[PDB]
């Protein structure tokens, strides 16, 4: 890429990263720049837009019981869910931030399984035998930390097994 | 489509001539005795300017190959402007000297790629030298000298600019506008101000001009427009209970709220005025948090955890007083703790260090200035509209030059700093002879800015240079007074940043340009 300075520079990226921003500017965990660092968060992958349909509470409350941060991946999140979310985070009930999926239907849907398997989580198949509140905290993936800014979301390390990691890579051989 | 191709010397000669035309037009505007260039426009009245970058932009050549040469040299002039906004004419001159000598080296049969490396290495060494020569610019008199020198030695310009930077502060925002009168005038604004008028013309507190002054008012910030949602009365009433004036900030206020409000203000029940937010939603919402924190108030989070009725009187921000007119709303001083004000500024540090630079930083700094600094506007006097253009343009160049001098320091003017550093680099050689010649070529090109100044003054460029070289340190020739002495004493200062940038940008384009073997262009 074109450099700002007159000097050549090298950048190395570790782990899974993608060009996604946060839908909740309000929730910043610590560093400024909209930076969010969640420690040992639960990761949620979904196939639908979230607005007026709040019904996912037992999944969200389950997270509250844990006392751990929640990372959300879905086609979109609107202000209704975000509004409840911002206040819940503000008082420390739950530390949760939501971001939009990778981008295009065949694009983001394809990249969701690997994110889920890498973090040991389960992708919510709206299409298949799964529903909005039908899914236990078990389903959510785990990572030691995540870095979120206005333009990008990064996962430090999702906890997943090598056989699953390698296996996802192995199915990639046809790809 | 179909192409016309030139190889070697024929290509370079055409390129050079194109460059020479561009540079010759640019050179006449360099120095105290520099002369104006007039740009023609079918749209209306022609523009006359001493600014080299503007002149460079307008030059295009009939010969396709010559045009190609001019277009490439055009960028150095334009790039220099982007960095410091000044020294663009000087940068073009360096490109002129470097290119001519470089091509001459190419003619000799030397490998231009090696020549380019020599030039590039020489440039790196020259840049390091400039930093050592650079001295801090802190006092008002030195700042005035750079402003005065930038504005083609106009003493009045330097005088006014120095007053403004000291007054507004280091992070303050200074702009320039045309003047109604024939005289130059400076306007300084303190506190939090924005270009927002009042929705209710009816509510005028004391001075007429749409002027509203509220004493110890409560400030309301909202994320919604109030049409039929008049409800919020317990909040308004709480203020009525308080007996204090109310200032309202929200996306919009309809006549329904205003109608009841007007009667309330006239008979003495409450004194309340409402104004629509800064402008665009991301921008208005972004500036609302600082307004609230500055005044000690709370922004109503319609979006998050707040409602129209829900909000106590204490939530509203407090200020000593505000000033409102049809075009603008100003707060004398919101009462907020110094730590919170500074804190908003502290979060702004990410905002300041932004990849965008142009546009984002200008607006950002304006917020910052309003938050803790000051804002200054300069009006320019002149009998006619075209005179005003020239005068105003130069003032901006001085403004950019002072900003550059403050941050990176200054070096002696008259091109003395480049010629003086050249003597230092007489010891620089590299990998092979072609590079050594390239290095040598750059050193010779350094001299040119000095001699153009003298040339424009009608005097022998070479004779003045010999005495200048003969001199020591800051010694040099003052073109305006037509005599030798200490350049610093004279008051002629070159910001280090413009001088450095000119050399760097000029050489980078020149190195690649001299290495061109073949040129491709469309047929006549």
């Amino acid at each position: 890429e074109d450099g700002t300075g007159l000097q050549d520079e090298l950048d190395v990226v570790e782990g899974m990263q993608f060009d996604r921003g946060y839908l909740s500017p309000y929730f910043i965990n610590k560093p400024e720049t909209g930076a969010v660092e969640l420690e040992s968060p639960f990761i949620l992958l979904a196939d639908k837009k979230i607005s007026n349909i709040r019904e996912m509470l037992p999944v969200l409350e389950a997270v509250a019981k844990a006392g751990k941060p929640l990372l959300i991946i879905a086609e979109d999140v609107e202000g209704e869910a975000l509004a409840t979310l911002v206040v819940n985070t503000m008082r420390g009930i739950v530390k949760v931030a939501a971001v939009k999926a990778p981008g295009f239907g065949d694009r983001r849907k394809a990249m969701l399984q690997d994110i889920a398997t890498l973090t040991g989580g389960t992708v919510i198949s709206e299409e298949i035998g799964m529903e909005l509140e039908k899914a236990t905290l078990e389903d959510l993936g785990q990572a030691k930390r995540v870095v979120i800014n206005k333009d990008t979301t990064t996962i430090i390390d999702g906890v997943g097994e090598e056989a699953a990691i390698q296996g996802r890579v192995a199915q990639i051989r046809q790809q | 489509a179909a192409k016309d191709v030139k190889f070697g010397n024929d290509a370079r000669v055409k390129m050079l001539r194109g460059v020479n035309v561009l540079a010759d037009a640019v050179k006449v505007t360099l120095g105290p005795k520099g002369r104006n260039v007039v740009l023609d426009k079918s749209f209306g009245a022609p523009t006359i300017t001493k600014d080299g970058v503007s002149v460079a932009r307008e030059i295009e050549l009939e010969d396709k190959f010559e045009n190609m040469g001019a277009q490439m040299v055009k960028e150095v002039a334009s790039k220099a402007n982007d960095a410091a906004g000044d020294g663009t004419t000087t940068a073009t001159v360096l490109a002129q000297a470097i290119i001519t000598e470089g091509l001459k080296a190419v003619a000799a049969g030397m490998n231009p790629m090696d020549l380019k490396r020599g030039i590039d290495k020489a440039v790196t060494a020259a840049v390091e030298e400039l930093k050592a020569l650079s001295v801090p610019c802190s006092d008002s008199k030195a700042i005035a000298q750079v402003g005065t020198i930038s504005a083609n030695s106009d003493e009045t310009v330097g005088k006014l600019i120095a007053e403004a930077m000291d007054k507004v502060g280091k992070e303050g925002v200074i702009t320039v506008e045309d003047g109604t009168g024939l005289q130059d005038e400076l306007d300084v604004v303190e506190g939090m101000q924005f270009d927002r008028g009042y929705l209710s013309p009816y509510f005028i507190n004391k001075p007429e001009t749409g002027a509203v002054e509220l004493e110890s008012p409560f400030i309301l910030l909202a994320d919604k427009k109030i049409s039929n949602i008049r409800e919020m009365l317990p909040v308004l009433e709480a203020v009525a209970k308080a007996g204090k004036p109310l200032l309202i900030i929200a996306e919009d206020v309809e006549g329904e709220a205003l109608a009841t409000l007007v009667v309330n203000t006239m008979r003495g029940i409450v004194k309340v005025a409402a104004v629509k937010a800064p402008g665009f939603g991301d921008r208005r919402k972004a500036m609302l948090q600082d307004i609230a924190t500055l005044t000690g108030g709370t922004v109503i989070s319609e979006e998050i955890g707040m409602e129209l009725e829900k909000a106590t009187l204490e939530d509203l921000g407090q200020a000593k007083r505000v000033v409102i007119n049809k075009d603008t709303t100003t707060i004398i001083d919101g009462v907020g703790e110094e730590a919170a004000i500074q804190g908003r500024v502290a979060q702004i540090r990410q905002q300041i260090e932004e990849a965008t630079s142009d546009y984002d930083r200008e607006k950002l700094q304006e917020r910052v200035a309003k938050l803790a600094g000051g804002v200054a506007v300069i009006k320019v006097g002149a009998a006619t509209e075209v005179e005003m253009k020239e005068k105003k343009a130069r003032v901006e160049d001085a403004l950019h030059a002072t900003r550059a001098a403050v941050e990176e320091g200054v070096v002696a003017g008259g091109g003395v700093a480049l010629i003086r550093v050249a003597s230092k680099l007489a010891d620089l050689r590299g990998q092979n002879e072609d590079q050594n010649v390239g290095i040598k070529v750059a050193l010779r090109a350094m001299e040119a800015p000095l001699r153009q100044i003298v040339l424009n003054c009608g005097e022998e460029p070479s004779v003045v240079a010999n005495t200048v070289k003969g001199g020591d340190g800051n010694y040099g020739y003052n073109a305006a007074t037509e005599e030798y002495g200490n350049m610093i004493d004279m008051g002629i200062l070159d910001p280090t940043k413009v001088t450095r940038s000119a050399l760097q940008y000029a050489a980078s384009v020149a190195g690649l340009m001299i290495t061109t073997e073949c040129m491709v262009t469309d047929l006549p």
Binding site: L57, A64, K65, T84, V87, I93 | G305
Partner: protein, 97 residues
Amino acid sequence: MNIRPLHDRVIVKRKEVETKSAGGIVLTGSAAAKSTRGEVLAVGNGRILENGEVKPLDVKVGDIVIFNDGYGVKSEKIDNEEVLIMSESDILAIVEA
């Protein structure tokens, strides 16, 4: 100034809308939804229809009730408070204990 309802009309007041205690410790922000619970402020004479006797309402003042919020439910301001006016038929349930 406490209102006297006219036969078969019951005056009740609505309780808090989407109270922040559903599903557990999760706070659900209001997203433009409304609640059917309230208390009976006043009881009318009874239902007049069919002349022979006036039947008293199967409700008493101060009860906590569940009702169907519909067109038949009217809103009035009492002592700068919100009160709803509806018939016995519109009240779906009684909350006891």
